[PDB]
Amino acid sequence: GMTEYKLVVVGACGVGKSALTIQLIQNHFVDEYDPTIEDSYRKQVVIDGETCLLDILDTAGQEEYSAMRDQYMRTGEGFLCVFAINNTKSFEDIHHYREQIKRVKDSEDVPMVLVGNKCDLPSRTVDTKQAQDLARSYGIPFIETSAKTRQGVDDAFYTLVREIRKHKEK
Numbered sequence: 474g475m476t477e478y479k480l481v482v483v484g485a486c487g488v489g490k491s492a493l494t495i496q497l498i499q500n501h502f503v504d505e506y507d508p509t510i511e512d513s514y515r516k517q518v519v520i521d522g523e524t525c526l527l528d529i530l531d532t533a534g535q536e537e538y539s540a541m542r543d544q545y546m547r548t549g550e551g552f553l554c555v556f557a558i559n560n561t562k563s564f565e566d567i568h569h570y571r572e573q574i575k576r577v578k579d580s581e582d583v584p585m586v587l588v589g590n591k592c593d594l595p596s597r598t599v600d601t602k603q604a605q606d607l608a609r610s611y612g613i614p615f616i617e618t619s620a621k622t623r624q625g626v627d628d629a630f631y632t633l634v635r636e637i638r639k640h641k642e643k
């Protein structure tokens with residue numbers, strides 16, 4: 474089979490994980506999607522000439538059993554860590570997601586991309602500089618996105634695939 478990249482989208486409730494995923498898969502903005510639904514989605518794409526499958530888990534937070542969270546973190550190859558640029562708490566929550574994924578995977582080398590979503594809004598509490606400072610400390614890419622306009626969406630997901638490829642070559 475063609476290569477499949479297992480991607481996981483994490484971040485506080487309300488940041489736009491479902492809207493980003495639906496824009497990536499369906500190329501539509503869905504402005505209302507039940508915050509409590511967690512599901513996977515698939516898309517066959519071409520990234521840098523490689524025909525591959527993106528198998529994306531759109532997370533929704535706590536699970537019935539914490540073993541389910543640990544399972545998807547171990548299964549996932551790369552993580553989109555999403556905050557919203559007008560929600561400081563969602564940005565502070567990135568520290569928890571970064572820690573938890575490394576902790577579960579028991580790894581100091583986990584492919585991740587920091588995503589600052591809702592960049593179409595002038596209303597902002599997290600400046601680009603502050604998010605760049607955090608991504609610099611993690612040694613990962615940072616991309617500002619808008620699930621509404623689709624700005625940065627393919628970049629965020631395709632960059633994560635490229636980070637997974639760099640990890641595999643070691």
Ligand SMILES: Nc1nc2c(ncn2[C@@H]2O[C@H](COP(=O)(O)OP(=O)(O)O)[C@@H](O)[C@H]2O)c(=O)[nH]1
Nearest residue numbers: 486487488489490491492504508591619620621
């Ligand atoms: N303006 C704007 N609103 C967005 C964007 N992405 C998501 N939203 C809105 O943010 C809210 C939460 O989005 P949702 O995808 O449910 O977030 P989730 O809880 O992380 O899955 C909804 O009201 C969406 O319409 C975006 O890029 N721009």
Ligand SMILES: c1ccc2c(Cn3ccnc3)c[nH]c2c1
Nearest residue numbers: 479480513528529530545548549
């Ligand atoms: C990454 C990590 C895990 C999954 C699953 C499995 N899964 C878990 C909950 N719902 C579905 C499918 N695609 C994935 C991509």
Ligand SMILES: [Mg+2]
Nearest residue numbers: 490491507508
């Ligand atoms: Mg959601």
